Amino acid sequence: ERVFQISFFNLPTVHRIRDIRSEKIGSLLSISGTVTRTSEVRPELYKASFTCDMCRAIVDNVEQSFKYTEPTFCPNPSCENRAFWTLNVTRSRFLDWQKVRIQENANEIPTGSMPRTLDVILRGDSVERAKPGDRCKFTGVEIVVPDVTQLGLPGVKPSSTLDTRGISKTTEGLRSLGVRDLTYKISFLACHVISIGSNIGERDQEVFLNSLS
């Protein structure tokens, strides 16, 4: 199956990198910035294939929601264990992935502040349309990415305990539970990339004249 990508462009407003707020997470939006760093084109696990460890039958086309997931269904009737799996990289399906770092434009910087950066992810055909040192307008979704950096920051960091109210227990004998941190940073996933001129306002001449009207 061919993987389809919808690219939106010509949004009415373009937002500054400092205008990014938490209420826009999960929303289509346009930003502009100067590309400072670009990464190698890499494969991303789109549709993985796993084999259950003791069933040893193949399953495929399991969707990946950002961080790496494993299925717990296992429609094979052989097992009674959901958690244990292994992943093969050859039968898995991949997507193109690039991380490009962008910076605040010079005129967009406030009076005394330093420029701040943002890591925006390009996938599919949008990969390698951004080059270091130019001004690019990205249209895409504001996403949120796990961040272990915020551990020492002041303020209460949200945590996530598993609720235990409908579990029957016995004190038979022979009390451990797992809690995960909810700390995140804002990133961007751009479906469309357009390169604005770095100025205020392809070697063959036949190529160049065809672009002009």
Binding site: E80, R82, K169, T170, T171, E172, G173, R175, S176
Partner: protein, 96 residues
Amino acid sequence: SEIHVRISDFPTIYSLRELRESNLSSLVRVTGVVTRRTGVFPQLKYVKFNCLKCGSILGPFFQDSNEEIRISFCTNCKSKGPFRVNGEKTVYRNYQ
């Protein structure tokens, strides 16, 4: 929560001396005189386990009468630890 169907008037009637391996895993109607019977025993029907690491009681599983059933995953500890049968929450059927 259980209905047992009793098949009546099976046509072919076998004696005990003419049973062969072709009758294995098949329905047979035989005549005979009862000589002795055991006491009624509880047989596991809906088996409930508890994990020794966590103490939680894991949901019931139906027990096949042919073979013993076992458990390998906790769903609360995500461990293969020692699981014990507690007869207090386990459901039983009569056996003779």
